[PDB]
Design an enzyme around this catalytic site. Sequence first.
Site, short mmCIF file in Angstrom:
data_model
loop_
_atom_site.label_atom_id
_atom_site.label_comp_id
_atom_site.label_asym_id
_atom_site.label_seq_id
_atom_site.Cartn_x
_atom_site.Cartn_y
_atom_site.Cartn_z
N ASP A 116 1.31 7.67 6.75
CA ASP A 116 1.80 6.41 6.21
C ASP A 116 1.01 5.22 6.73
O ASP A 116 0.63 4.32 5.97
CB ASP A 116 3.28 6.24 6.53
CG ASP A 116 3.90 5.07 5.80
OD1 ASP A 116 3.22 4.49 4.92
OD2 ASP A 116 5.06 4.71 6.10
N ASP A 117 0.77 5.17 8.04
CA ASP A 117 0.16 4.00 8.67
C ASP A 117 -0.72 4.45 9.82
O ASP A 117 -0.22 4.70 10.93
CB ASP A 117 1.23 3.02 9.15
CG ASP A 117 0.65 1.68 9.51
OD1 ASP A 117 -0.37 1.64 10.23
OD2 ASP A 117 1.22 0.65 9.08
N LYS B 292 -11.29 17.33 9.57
CA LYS B 292 -12.47 18.12 9.20
C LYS B 292 -12.25 19.60 9.49
O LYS B 292 -13.13 20.26 10.05
CB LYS B 292 -13.71 17.63 9.94
CG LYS B 292 -14.25 16.30 9.48
CD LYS B 292 -15.75 16.21 9.69
CE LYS B 292 -16.16 16.64 11.10
NZ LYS B 292 -15.34 16.00 12.16
N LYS C 85 5.26 -8.14 -1.53
CA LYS C 85 6.42 -8.12 -0.65
C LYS C 85 6.87 -9.53 -0.32
O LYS C 85 8.06 -9.87 -0.41
CB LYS C 85 6.08 -7.35 0.63
CG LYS C 85 7.21 -6.54 1.21
CD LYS C 85 6.67 -5.45 2.11
CE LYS C 85 7.77 -4.57 2.69
NZ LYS C 85 7.24 -3.66 3.74
N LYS D 226 0.82 -1.21 0.00
CA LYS D 226 0.00 0.00 0.00
C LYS D 226 0.85 1.26 0.00
O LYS D 226 0.56 2.21 -0.74
CB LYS D 226 -0.93 -0.01 1.21
CG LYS D 226 -1.83 -1.23 1.28
CD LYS D 226 -2.62 -1.26 2.57
CE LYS D 226 -1.88 -2.03 3.65
NZ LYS D 226 -2.05 -3.50 3.48
N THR D 227 1.91 1.30 0.81
CA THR D 227 2.68 2.53 0.97
C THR D 227 3.24 3.01 -0.35
O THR D 227 3.17 4.20 -0.67
CB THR D 227 3.82 2.30 1.97
OG1 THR D 227 3.34 1.56 3.10
CG2 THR D 227 4.38 3.63 2.44
N1 LIG Z 1 -31.26 23.88 4.96
C1 LIG Z 1 -29.97 23.61 5.21
N2 LIG Z 1 -29.66 22.97 6.36
C2 LIG Z 1 -28.38 22.70 6.62
N3 LIG Z 1 -27.30 22.98 5.88
C3 LIG Z 1 -27.64 23.61 4.76
C4 LIG Z 1 -28.91 23.96 4.35
N4 LIG Z 1 -28.88 24.60 3.13
C5 LIG Z 1 -27.61 24.63 2.83
N5 LIG Z 1 -26.80 24.05 3.76
C6 LIG Z 1 -25.35 23.92 3.70
O1 LIG Z 1 -25.00 22.77 4.43
C7 LIG Z 1 -23.68 22.94 5.00
C8 LIG Z 1 -23.82 22.73 6.48
O2 LIG Z 1 -23.30 21.42 6.80
P1 LIG Z 1 -22.71 21.10 8.23
O3 LIG Z 1 -21.27 20.81 8.17
O4 LIG Z 1 -23.12 22.22 9.18
O5 LIG Z 1 -23.53 19.82 8.66
P2 LIG Z 1 -23.74 18.98 9.99
O6 LIG Z 1 -24.43 17.70 9.74
O7 LIG Z 1 -24.39 19.91 11.01
O8 LIG Z 1 -22.25 18.76 10.46
P3 LIG Z 1 -21.43 17.92 11.53
O9 LIG Z 1 -22.32 16.72 11.83
O10 LIG Z 1 -20.20 17.44 10.77
O11 LIG Z 1 -21.13 18.76 12.72
C9 LIG Z 1 -23.30 24.39 4.69
O12 LIG Z 1 -22.68 24.35 3.41
C10 LIG Z 1 -24.66 25.05 4.46
O13 LIG Z 1 -24.45 26.05 3.48
N1 LIG Z 2 3.84 -2.68 -8.35
C1 LIG Z 2 4.17 -2.77 -7.06
N2 LIG Z 2 3.18 -2.81 -6.14
C2 LIG Z 2 3.51 -2.90 -4.85
N3 LIG Z 2 4.72 -2.97 -4.29
C3 LIG Z 2 5.68 -2.94 -5.22
C4 LIG Z 2 5.50 -2.84 -6.59
N4 LIG Z 2 6.72 -2.84 -7.24
C5 LIG Z 2 7.59 -2.93 -6.27
N5 LIG Z 2 7.04 -2.99 -5.02
C6 LIG Z 2 7.75 -3.10 -3.76
O1 LIG Z 2 6.80 -3.47 -2.78
C7 LIG Z 2 7.16 -2.89 -1.50
C8 LIG Z 2 6.00 -2.02 -1.09
O2 LIG Z 2 6.21 -1.63 0.29
P1 LIG Z 2 5.00 -1.32 1.25
O3 LIG Z 2 5.44 -0.64 2.48
O4 LIG Z 2 3.92 -0.58 0.46
O5 LIG Z 2 4.43 -2.75 1.57
P2 LIG Z 2 3.52 -3.41 2.69
O6 LIG Z 2 4.25 -4.41 3.48
O7 LIG Z 2 2.23 -3.87 2.01
O8 LIG Z 2 3.16 -2.15 3.57
P3 LIG Z 2 3.12 -1.71 5.09
O9 LIG Z 2 4.11 -2.64 5.79
O10 LIG Z 2 3.68 -0.29 5.09
O11 LIG Z 2 1.73 -1.80 5.62
C9 LIG Z 2 8.40 -2.05 -1.79
O12 LIG Z 2 9.50 -2.94 -1.68
C10 LIG Z 2 8.26 -1.75 -3.28
O13 LIG Z 2 9.58 -1.68 -3.79
#
Ligand SMILES: Nc1ncnc2c1ncn2[C@@H]1O[C@H](COP(=O)(O)OP(=O)(O)OP(=O)(O)O)[C@@H](O)[C@H]1O
Ligand SMILES: Nc1ncnc2c1ncn2[C@@H]1O[C@H](COP(=O)(O)OP(=O)(O)OP(=O)(O)O)[C@@H](O)[C@H]1O
Lengths: 534, 107
Positions: free
Chosen positions: A397-398, A425, A502, A343-344
Amino acid sequence: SIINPDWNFEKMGIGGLDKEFSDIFRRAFASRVFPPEIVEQMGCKHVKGILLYGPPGCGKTLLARQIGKMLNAREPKVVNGPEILNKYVGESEANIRKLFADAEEEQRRLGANSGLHIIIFDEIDAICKQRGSMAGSTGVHDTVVNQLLSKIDGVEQLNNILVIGMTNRPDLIDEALLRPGRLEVKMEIGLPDEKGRLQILHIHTARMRGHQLLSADVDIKELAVETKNFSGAELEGLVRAAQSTAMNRHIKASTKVEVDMEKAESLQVTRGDFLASLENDIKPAFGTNQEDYASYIMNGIIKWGDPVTRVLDDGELLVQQTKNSDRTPLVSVLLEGPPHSGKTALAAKIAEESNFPFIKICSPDKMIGFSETAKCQAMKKIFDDAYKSQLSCVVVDDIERLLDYVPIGPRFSNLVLQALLVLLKKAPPQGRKLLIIGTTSRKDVLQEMEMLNAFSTTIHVPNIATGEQLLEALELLGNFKDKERTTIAQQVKGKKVWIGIKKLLMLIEMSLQMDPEYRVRKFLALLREEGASP
Amino acid sequence: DRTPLVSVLLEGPPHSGKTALAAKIAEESNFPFIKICSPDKMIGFSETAKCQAMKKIFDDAYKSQLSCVVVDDIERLLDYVPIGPRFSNLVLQALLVLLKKAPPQGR
Ligand SMILES: Nc1ncnc2c1ncn2[C@@H]1O[C@H](COP(=O)(O)OP(=O)(O)OP(=O)(O)O)[C@@H](O)[C@H]1O
Ligand SMILES: Nc1ncnc2c1ncn2[C@@H]1O[C@H](COP(=O)(O)OP(=O)(O)OP(=O)(O)O)[C@@H](O)[C@H]1O
Ligand SMILES: Nc1ncnc2c1ncn2[C@@H]1O[C@H](COP(=O)(O)OP(=O)(O)O)[C@@H](O)[C@H]1O
């Protein structure tokens, strides 16, 4: 009046910033430029200080020195924040007091005609009872701030002072130092741009042009466009390093090759030095680090199956999305896959092809032995720094190993969980984009803890599951013979293949450690041993 | 005249837009004093700091003749997480005691 109404800021050091001067003058020092007669007829006081905040090493003190000089004031009395600190009880207060002795004496003697003194702090945040809020113990014996306040104003009035402060963490300043009648004007010094870089480079290279010692080959526009997100000091460092390298090369060549004196006296810096030092000497803190890629992408990426292309294309779509759009200044995406699915490397790759100016990788590898509060500090610092660029893309990374998870218990550090959940957020300062990429191997656990809900998208990274895929990967790596490949293909048609890349690389390396006679049998035996059935 | 202190609670499914409605209703009151206390401004604090911040906001709000104080995302303040469960007790007690305290007469 001691200055012209339009001021002047050019070829006198500071060249990058020109608008800030006019803004600050229009806002603050209008009193001291107008005909005095009406000033005394006006019964109006003068602003008693200002504060500046910006990224470190962007040329702030120069502004203070220039503004002190132009106003026809006395010598500034520099001082350092941490320097004014002692462990003996009731000692720092004497230090803070002594700074105003000269101003007090002049005010007492000359009355209301004395000159102007200026005092320049540095990291004013050093003395505040607000840093103690964060996890730690730095109460700094608040008395200091009270002394400073009661000296700037209070029962005794001073009308011949101007306090200028410089800091880097604007948040940690006590609020009380911003009420009207005290430090009451703020300003921001952002990063320089193309034109500013051009001006600074031109300024710092005047001597070489005057003496013609610079090579004619070098331009300044090319280098200016090259440096993406450098800072002030970095350009000077680059010039110095280029000079040093050019001269070292010249002397080594002269010693090696007995060149005629004509070139020996000539010390042309040439153009190769600039690029060489740029790519090998200076490492901007706010810029891309080409070095870190190799430390994680150690074997490149070889297309062995369709999913790689799909994942890369989806990453490209996400990048395009975050670059140019509104109503969504923040985006997120999470990668999930079984252990050892590489993944990395994929995350590092996609980040590279993003081509953004500012890119940083924060992994647990550089934090061993840290208590949790330190981890919170690191997260906060890196995100705050990333907030200071027009674009940005961070890679966590992780996620799992950050929380200290362990199936027994279960157990983990709640504080880090909160910090991450809240941070994911928070929109950047206005007009700035962002991009966050995660990574994990335990999807279910994250789903359970309600954190998966915060992320805004998911992608899947499968493994090798088909024999022909294994054959193609082996062929791409190129380590097995034709008859050997035939034997492997014959023995691997069972299709019960499910392995991670790997593990495949490690297994191949292990199987390549005996004579050619037994490689195939040992490799087959080891592969059969790892008969995973997800 | 006989009910100096009032309370109200909004709730709904996630992503339903509650914070926006709260802010809007607060703005449309035309009260002279308004103040919003959110978790976003206290990253990494220690619980004692959170309690002090809450106390400061409410103390400042007391002094005026009218006011409207908004607390956003109660659950995040408490630091809830379904596993366990685990959370902070101190914040909960501070909030609960605060939420039924009358200001000085005639406010
Ligand atoms: N009638 C409405 N009610 C709520 N939000 C609205 C409405 N009309 C437009 N919006 C837009 O919705 C967004 C508000 O979303 P908000 O992040 O406040 O949601 P939330 O569910 O209260 O959030 P959180 O759960 O993450 O605290 C703003 O962009 C606001 O402009
Ligand atoms: N196409 C490929 N896809 C994935 N890995 C590849 C590819 N080609 C080479 N590699 C080798 O795979 C390894 C990827 O390392 P990586 O840290 O992403 O692996 P992991 O063990 O799945 O991850 P982690 O331990 O961070 O959760 C590196 O040695 C990279 O050189
Ligand atoms: N706008 C600018 N023009 C010219 N030089 C600059 C500028 N900004 C920074 N510098 C360089 O930075 C150095 C001083 O940095 P300094 O003012 O100490 O940074 P800070 O004020 O952030 O501590 C000088 O050597 C100068 O060449």
